[PDB]
Amino acid sequence: AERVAAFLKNVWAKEPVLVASFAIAGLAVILPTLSPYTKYSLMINRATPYNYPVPLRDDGNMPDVPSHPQDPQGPSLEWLKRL
Amino acid sequence: MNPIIFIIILLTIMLGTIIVMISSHWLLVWIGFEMNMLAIIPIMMKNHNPRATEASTKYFLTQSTASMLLMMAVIINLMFSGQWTVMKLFNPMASMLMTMALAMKLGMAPFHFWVPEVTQGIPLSSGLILLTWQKLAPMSVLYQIFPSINLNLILTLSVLSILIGGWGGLNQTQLRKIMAYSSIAHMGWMTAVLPYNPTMTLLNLIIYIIMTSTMFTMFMANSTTTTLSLSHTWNKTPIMTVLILATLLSMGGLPPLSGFMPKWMIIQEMTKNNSIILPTFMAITALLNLYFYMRLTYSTTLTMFPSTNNMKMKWQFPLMKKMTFLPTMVVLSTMMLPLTPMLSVLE
Amino acid sequence: VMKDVPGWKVGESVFHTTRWVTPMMGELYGLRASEEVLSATYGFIWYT
Amino acid sequence: MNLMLALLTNFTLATLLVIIAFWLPQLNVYSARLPFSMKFFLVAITFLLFDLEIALLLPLPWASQTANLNTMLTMALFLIILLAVSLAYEWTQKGLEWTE
Amino acid sequence: AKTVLRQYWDIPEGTECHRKTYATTSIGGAAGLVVSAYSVALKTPTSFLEGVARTGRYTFTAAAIGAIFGLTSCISAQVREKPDDPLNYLIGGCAGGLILGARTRSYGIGAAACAYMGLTAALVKMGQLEGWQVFAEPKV
Amino acid sequence: TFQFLPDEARSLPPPKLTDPRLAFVGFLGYCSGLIDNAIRRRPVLLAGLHRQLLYITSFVFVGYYLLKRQDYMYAVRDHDMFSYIKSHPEDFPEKDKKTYGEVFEEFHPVR
Amino acid sequence: PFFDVQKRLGVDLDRWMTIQSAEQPHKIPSRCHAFEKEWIECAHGIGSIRAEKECKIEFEDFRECLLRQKTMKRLHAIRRQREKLIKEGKYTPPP
Amino acid sequence: MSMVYMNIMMAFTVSLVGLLMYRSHLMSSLLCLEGMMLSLFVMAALTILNSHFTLASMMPIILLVFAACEAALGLSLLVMVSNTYGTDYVQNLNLLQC
Amino acid sequence: PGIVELPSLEDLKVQEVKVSSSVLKAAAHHYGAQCDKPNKEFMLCRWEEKDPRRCLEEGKLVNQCALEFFRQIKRHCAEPFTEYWTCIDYSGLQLFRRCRKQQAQFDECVLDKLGWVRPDLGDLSKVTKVKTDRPLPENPYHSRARPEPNPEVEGDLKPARHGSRLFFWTM
Amino acid sequence: MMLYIVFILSVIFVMGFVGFSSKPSPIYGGLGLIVSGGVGCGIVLNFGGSFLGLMVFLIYLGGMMVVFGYTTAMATEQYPEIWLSNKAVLGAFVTGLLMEFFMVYYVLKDKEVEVVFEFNGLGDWVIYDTGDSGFFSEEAMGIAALYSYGTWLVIVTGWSLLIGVVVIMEITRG
Ligand SMILES: CCCCCCCCCCCCO[C@@H]1O[C@H](CO)[C@@H](O[C@H]2O[C@H](CO)[C@@H](O)[C@H](O)[C@H]2O)[C@H](O)[C@H]1O
Ligand SMILES: CCCCCCCCCCCCO[C@@H]1O[C@H](CO)[C@@H](O[C@H]2O[C@H](CO)[C@@H](O)[C@H](O)[C@H]2O)[C@H](O)[C@H]1O
Ligand SMILES: CCCCCCCCCCCCO[C@@H]1O[C@H](CO)[C@@H](O[C@H]2O[C@H](CO)[C@@H](O)[C@H](O)[C@H]2O)[C@H](O)[C@H]1O
Ligand SMILES: N=C(N)NC(=N)NCCc1ccc(I)c(Cl)c1
């Protein structure tokens, strides 16, 4: 550890540009896995409707599928509004 | 070259070939050839001399031209079928362009001129890769597109290579050029049987690679690149001359040696298809190769050529070259005929 | 126009299938004025 | 049409300015190798190879819109790291030196 | 090349000699042109005229062989009244071989060419009668 | 798909460890060991017996599996052929066999 | 592939881009998606020797969608005839 | 086929004939090689765009990237040839005749 | 090959919704809530039949629902709506966020005089379900009968009869 | 007419190819390839290939062809030979130019032509797609997919570019 700190002080004195580069590059690799917000990036992208939502033929056995856009069933974006 | 870089470049040569062999998409096949060609140039150039630069440049121009023609065939195939799947092509003009492109890469006659010149101009180890490993990727594509190949075109390429390879080797005293023309002739056997039984193409390719590797390894052990240099082997490593004799007789297709097997099975497959004139013509024409293999055996093993006084200094030092796999390769190159039915593993 | 062309059948499909096929540009605007065709073909690509 | 007009105007004007610049009243009645340096060649080639990697990164703003963000982020970083490795190799092999 | 060979083998042997001699002469001329093209590309002539002289020399030499073979083999079949006979082609093949000796001004080449080309033509006739395949279609 | 020995090959009897082909493979491995000694100028018969043993063992080990695939590929060929013959009886009719008393053969005297 | 590593491992290295009727970003279909689908489904599993003869109708339709040669030829015919009649003043086109 | 394919196919043939009929400069033959790539890029792009083969839209870029890398290798060989002889003339690359 | 059947010019006639795109954009959110059922019935038909000729009747109902939708805005909320879509029409990108005041006046007017509630963020992008008496198509692709699969192979794998049978080899 | 813009660009494309393919001084050959590259981008642009068209400018012209001219000025030609002063170049240029014109004349006269193969001559606009009302660029969606679907393409492509650096440093070290 002490040898690790002595090495870091040496590079900080002689090559601060490279030290900063490696530190930034290390944060870029690591921080997405530690961030609680990374999961919303997946959800927001999926929630963007690029193409038409084709309706399903009602067979009488789809209680979880809304009949009207304003009916309660179906995905909600309330989590996105509060974000 | 740095030893680690040399390893990574060798692995890239292999990776490019592997990509060609595992790909189902034509673009990835093209990428495999591009990556493979990029990585092989540095081992042609590694000895840094005008001859190695000329060989690398002649090689680059040939392979780049062939890859452009291949990409044309792929794009024409896309236009007329709307897909990239590696298989039969869906347009006869595309088939001719891909067949010609792959013939150029393999150095088949009449696209053969680069093979003797490039092999002569590069080190023995690089020539070993050029004449063995580099045949794998183009042959594996031919293995998959052969249903759509024009029969007359492929058999014409095969017949020309057997004639050009046989005649070209008669005038050679350089070992690398002898191997180059020998390679051209052997490619002709591989493609002549491909329309009838691709399995026999694989058998010929594998056995050819084994005997070709054996010969290059034995040349490398003694640093011999010319006939006259090889004629000094008897006065240094007498065992090596016997191994060279046995391997050359095998490459000549003489029973009871392993090199008889591919010619034997190709003749069988062609006769089953009522092809009689062609196999007979091929077998007789292959006697040209036997002639200049026999010439090498005369000057290497069956006679003792004049020596030099300084050779005595060599008697006091042992062989220190790796000669990797040589004992195994030579035994497979000569003693495999009794196991011929094992070819079914390639089915 | 093709009333007196021998053998011509009017509105004959070029496809074996009877499935509806989306017409290409020349099928819809084939006989229309060049200004409309130009707008339908290159108007979006050329817009500012 | 507008862009074609703009381009034609810009270069047509540039041609005209060159014209009058070369012809105004004057009022008077009376393939070898260029001392080739290998270092400048390697700068150009290095620029080319880095330029091709930039071509591969340019789609990134659109790629971030995917639902497959796990794959997309991993490949984006992989490409940039390999670019850094290329620079590191050139650097440590004295490819960025101008002496000798 | 398939169109001329279709014309030649369509005519019965020993009949319509002039048509037969035209097909073989044109076939011989094509081979001569092919040889000239490779010869000029791989062995550069000293001048443009030298390249033209060589092309004509090879091309006429090859058409001369093609003409004599066609004419001689068609007369032999007519005179002997033996259409489906390989011996007519052997006679026609050897005649073409002698021309090569004359055009190359040699006696050994003419004798060697007569025997080798004479046998080859006879073999070609046998294969036509017996349906021998050179480039056989894959069947099994 | 891309399998050296598919699972269906296990219904076939294994090659015997005394297979004559396997013995020949072992002999080839022995020969390679001697040629290794010879090219390096060691005593051909005695030098490096540990190395000579691995040459034989390696050849036999690889040879055994190659023989297994060989036999399985020929079993598959026969299986395919017999199934196709059953599926297409019209192409393989059972031949009407006559005796030599009924069959006429020309006689060609040697005189 | 010569060695079908992809199927052996179940990994998809390049199959995703081999045909235009495969999955696409945002379900954007190709113009000939329905023709490719019909031809692929007709020819599936029977081998190219059989499919060349038995799926010829689907393949001919698919090739027509790809390059539109027959459609262009038919349009060429109607336009060529229309120019003739107008050149002879026998036809006036509607607005 | 559509009318554009005529000229794009012609352009490839022109550059292919240019590549196969060398003059003196090795650079001139490299330009024909890159001309071949250009015509391939355009033809592939036209086919892919017109057919709306969405995922294939990246293919011309991959072709461009790899072909540029191949051209970089070719240029490196040209300069090494030029360093040896002082020109990029292909008539100097005839040592392996013997 | 046969004749492409086309509906007559008269079968295509319908009363058009001849309003500009800023008008449609302004009314889009209430339009989606109000005319959902005929609209979703039409879109189900199109994606199931894959043929515009087979959904002309449903397409006409889509037009009628929209015309009645805009007749109710005209009757009650003509002035607030006109201010709103004029605000949208000014923007080169027709942006909602530039017109929140006017949108509020129109939204309050329709709610007061028509009970219309603007659907929330995410509502109109839902996959809903439609009840249709139209029969589900059987062969929408008009596929031919698929070729018969090759005769399968079944049985017990036995050793090859007399081995390889290659020339003289006995195994 | 502007309805033939793609065809007109393709004609110019061919003439530029005949330009450098007849192989004048590499300085002029490089110029001919640059003009063909720009015209080639224009053809791609008119098929909806906005991003692809601009890559030719950015990468082919601004990258590869810049390096070609840089190398030509440094290792090939420093002073161009007068254009078409050589007989073979002039003959090859004239021969190709006449072939293109004869092609273009007939296709425009008959609205078709058979140059080895059959080509329609009604205008490339006829094959265009008649329905497009998506809220995105399809070309952009396809190219963006390189990072989601094309993991394997990224790996091999990125690896090859790294080996390109390594290989070129080896080649030139000498
Ligand atoms: C020389 C080769 C160099 C290669 C370098 C590759 C570096 C890659 C580092 C990061 C890779 C993964 O980076 C990130 O990890 C977290 C782990 O929770 C993932 O997970 C996060 O996003 C996903 C969405 O897909 C959510 O479902 C999940 O709840 C969330 O935690 C992210 O989707 C991913 O973007
Ligand atoms: C030293 C010897 C060197 C090698 C010699 C090789 C000899 C090979 C024999 C020649 C090939 C056999 O000859 C070939 O046989 C087939 C069999 O119908 C003929 O085939 C022909 O059939 C009919 C006529 O019957 C024709 O209408 C048709 O055009 C053609 O296909 C060929 O026209 C003929 O050229
Ligand atoms: C020589 C280099 C050695 C290193 C070898 C590294 C090989 C890496 C292989 C990467 C591909 C792995 O396998 C593949 O991965 C991606 C996700 O990662 C998956 O792909 C996934 O995302 C995209 C987006 O839709 C689609 O391809 C597909 O819908 C989905 O499956 C594939 O379904 C899976 O088959
Ligand atoms: N294309 C060819 N003519 N050859 C070919 N491989 N035929 C397939 C017949 C065959 C032969 C041996 C075996 I063992 C198996 Cl399993 C199958």
Distance CA A44, CA A23 (A): 29
User: What are the helix (H) ranges across A15-72?
Assistant: 16-34, 38-46
Distance CA E26, CA E29 (A): 5
DSSP class of J114: E
| Domain CATH number, residue H24 | 1.10.287.3510
* Nearest of J160, G57, E88, I71 to residue B39 by alpha carbon: J160
From ligand 3's centre to the CA of F24, what distance in Å?
46
Residue A42 Cβ contacting ligand 1 at under 6 Å: yes
Q: Measured in whole angstroms, how far is the alpha carbon of residue F49 from the centre of its chain?
A: 30
Q: Is B20:B36 a contact under the CB 8 Å cutoff?
A: yes
Query: How many domains are there within chain H?
Result: 1
Distance CA D70, CA B307 (A): 70
CA dihedral F10, F15, F16, F18 (to 10 degrees): -160
Residue H20 belongs to what domain range? 3-85
Rounded distance between C-alpha atoms, residue B102 and residue B66, angstroms? 7
Backbone angles phi, psi at J114, to 5 degrees: -115, 95
**Residue B170: other Cβ atoms inside 10 A:** 13
Please choose, from the candidates A25, E69, G38, the residue with its C-alpha nearest in 3D space to the C-alpha of residue B82.
G38
Assign B46 to helix, strand or coil.
Answer: coil
In DSSP terms, G19 is beta-bridged to B83
User: Class assignment of domain J4-169?
Assistant: mainly alpha
Query: What one-character-per-residue DSSP string does G39-74 give?
Result: HHHHHTTT-HHHHHHHTHHHHHHHHHHHH-HHHHHH
Q: Is D49 on the interface with H (CB under 8 A)?
A: yes
CB B160 within 8 A of CB B106: no
What does the alpha-carbon distance between residue H96 and residue B176 come to, in Å, rounded to a whole number? 12
3-class DSSP state of J112: strand
Give dist(CA A64, CA A74) in Å, integer: 7
Euclidean distance between CA atoms E12 and A54, whole angstroms? 73
Q: Which residue from E132, E135, E139 is facing B155, i.e. has the nearest CB?
A: E135
The angle formed by the CA atoms of residues B231, B232 and B233, to the nearest 5 degrees, is: 90
* A5 Cβ contact list (under 8 Å, min separation 6): none
How far apart, in whole angstroms, are the C-alpha atoms of residue B65 and residue F27? 48
Residue D74 makes CB contacts below 8 A (sequence gap 6+) with none
Q: Which DSSP string do the residues of chain C spell out, in sequence order?
A: --TTSTT--TTB-SSSS-S-----HHHHSTTS-HHHHHHHHHHHHH--
B94 within 8 A of B79, measured Cβ to Cβ? no
DSSP string, I68-126: HHHHHHHHHHHHHHHHHHHHHHHSSS--GGG-HHHHHHHHHHHHHHH---PPPTTTTTS
Nearest ligand for residue E133 CA: 2
Q: Is I144 on the interface with G (CB under 8 A)?
A: yes
Segments making up each domain of chain J, as ranges:
4-169
CB contact under 8 A, J44 and H49: yes
- Within 10 A of D14 (CB to CB), how many other CB atoms are there? 10
Partner residue facing B341 (CB), from F31, F32, F70: F70
Q: Do chains D and E touch (3 or more CB pairs under 8 A)?
A: no
G14 touches chain F (CB under 8 A): no
Q: Is B344 in the pocket of ligand 4 (CB under 6 A)?
A: yes
Whose CA is closest to D58, among A27, H70, H64? Answer: H64
> Is H19 part of a structural domain of the chain?
yes
Report how far residue I69's alpha carbon sits from residue I35's, in angstroms, rounded to the nearest whole number.
8
**DSSP code, position G22:** S
Asked if J93 and J19 touch (Cβ cutoff 8 Å), the reply is: yes
Task: Check if the beta carbon of residue J19 is closer than 8 Å to that of residue J100.
Answer: no
Phi-psi domain of B254 (left: phi exceeds 0; alpha: psi -120 through 50; beta: other): beta
Write the single-letter amino acid at D17: L
Contact C19, G37 (CB under 8 A): no
Q: Please report whether residue H90 resides in a domain.
A: no
Backbone angles phi, psi at B46, to 5 degrees: -65, -25
- What lies within 8 Å, CB to CB, of C26 at 6+ separation is G71, G72, G75, J122, J125, J126, J127
Please name each of the domains of chain D with its CATH number.
Answer: 7-92 (1.20.58.1610)
Preceding peptide of B110 cis, ω within 30°:
yes
**Residue D73 and residue A46: Cβ atoms within 8 Å?**
no
> Strand, helix or coil at B9?
helix
Q: How far apart are the C-alpha atoms of B184 and A79, rounded to whole Å?
A: 70
H1 vs G74: CA distance, rounded Å = 13
Dist. CA C19–CA C40, nearest whole Å:
25
H81 CB within 8 Å of a chain B CB:
yes
> Cα separation of B321 and B323, whole Å?
6
User: From CA J27, how far away is CA H27, in angstroms rounded?
Assistant: 10
Helix boundaries (H) for chain D? 2-22, 38-57, 60-63, 69-92
CA distances from A78 to A50, A74, I124 (A): 19, 12, 14
**Cβ atoms of residues B338 and F58 within 8 Å:** no
Contact assignment for C42 to J5 by CB distance below 8 Å: yes
Residues 6+ apart with CB under 8 A from I47: A54
Q: Is residue H63 part of a domain?
A: yes
Q: Which residues of H56-76 are buried (b: 16+ CB within 10 A; e: fewer)?
A: bbbbbbbbbbbbbbbbbbbbb
* Cβ neighbourhood burial of H35 (10 Å; 0-12, 13-18, 19+): buried
Contact in structure between B249 and B293 (CB atoms under 8 Å): yes
First to last CA, chain J: 57
Q: Which two tokens stand for residue G76?
A: 């060429």
Judge whether J153 is closer than 8 Å to chain D, CB to CB: no
How many CA atoms lie less than 13 Å away from H58 in the CB half-sphere? 29
Question: Cα(B188)–Cα(B202) distance, rounded to whole angstroms?
Answer: 13
Give phi and psi for C12, each to the nearest 5. -75, 135
Amino acid at F108: H
Structure tokens at B230: 């090889």
Which of B44, B36, B46 minimizes the C-alpha distance to B12?
A: B36
What's the rounded Cα separation, in Å, for the pair E88 and I13?
Answer: 83
Q: Is residue G47 classed exposed, middle or buried when 0-12, 13-18 and 19+ CB atoms within 10 A define those classes? A: exposed
Is the Cβ atom of A35 under 6 angstroms away from ligand 1?
Answer: no
For F4, list phi and psi in degrees, rounded to 5. -70, -50
Q: Which of B61, B153, B66, B49 is nearest to B104 (CA)?
A: B66
H9 located within any domain: yes
Tokens of B13: 């040569």
Instruction: Kindly provide the b/e burial profile for residues J83-100, where b requires at least 16 CB atoms within 10 angstroms of the residue's own CB.
Output: beebeebeebbeebeeeb
Task: Name the method of structure determination.
Answer: cryo-EM
Report the candidate in B109, J47, B146 with the shortest Cα–Cα distance to residue H60. Answer: J47
Q: What is the DSSP string of chain F?
A: ---SS-GGGGGSPPPPTT-HHHHHHHHHHHHHHHHHHHHTTS-TTTS-HHHHHHHHHHHHHHHHHHHHHHHHHHHHHHHHHHHHHHH-GGGSPPP-PPPTTTS--------
For ligand 1, say whether the CB of D75 is within 6 Å of any of its atoms: no
Copy the structure tokens of residue J80: 């161009």
F41, two tokens = 């100028």
Residue H98 lies in a domain: no
Q: Which residues of C touch G65 (CB under 8 A)?
A: 15, 21
- As to burial, measured by CB atoms within 10 angstroms (0-12 exposed, 13-18 middle, 19+ buried), residue H83 is middle
CB contact set of A52 (below 8 Å; sequence gap of 6+): I43
User: Which residue has the CA at smallest separation from atom 3 of ligand 3?
Assistant: J155
For residue B74, CA distances in Å to B99, E133, J143 come to 12, 33, 20
Peptide linkage before B256 cis (omega within 30 of 0) = yes
Q: Assess contact for I77 and I114: CB atoms under 8 A.
A: yes
The C-alpha of J116 sits at a distance from chain G's nearest C-alpha, in angstroms, of: 16
Q: Is H49 contained in some domain?
A: yes
- Which positions in chain B touch J160 (Cβ < 8 Å)? 31, 34-35, 38
DSSP symbol at H22: -
Residues of chain F contacting residue I171, judged by C-beta atoms under 8 Å apart: 19-21
**Binding pocket residue ranges, ligand 3, CB within 6 Å:** B 15; D 68, 71; G 11-12, 16, 23; J 148-149, 151-152, 155
Evaluate the CA torsion angle H5, H10, H13, H15 in order and state its sign.
Answer: negative
Give E98's contacts (C-beta < 8 A, 6+ positions apart): E110, E113, E114
Cα B54–B60–B66 angle (5° rounding)?
140
Cβ–Cβ under 8 Å, residues H93 and B58: yes
Q: Are I77 and I110 in contact (CB under 8 A)?
A: yes
Q: Residue I3 forms beta bridges with which residues?
A: C12
**CB of residue A32 inside a 6 A radius of ligand 1:** yes
Q: Helix, strand or coil for residue A11?
A: helix
Classify I152 as helix, strand or coil: coil
Q: Are the C-beta atoms of C30 and J126 separated by less than 8 Å?
A: yes
- Residue F102 has phi, psi (to 5 degrees) of -90, -30
Contact B176, B127 (CB under 8 A): yes
CA–CA dist J163, J174 (Å, integer): 18
Alpha carbon distance B332, B257 (integer Å): 9
How far is B111 from B103, CA to CA, in rounded Å? 7
Contacts of D69 in chain A (CB under 8 A): 41-42, 45
Q: Which residues pair with H89 in a beta bridge?
A: H25
At A57, give phi and psi (nearest 5°): -65, 125
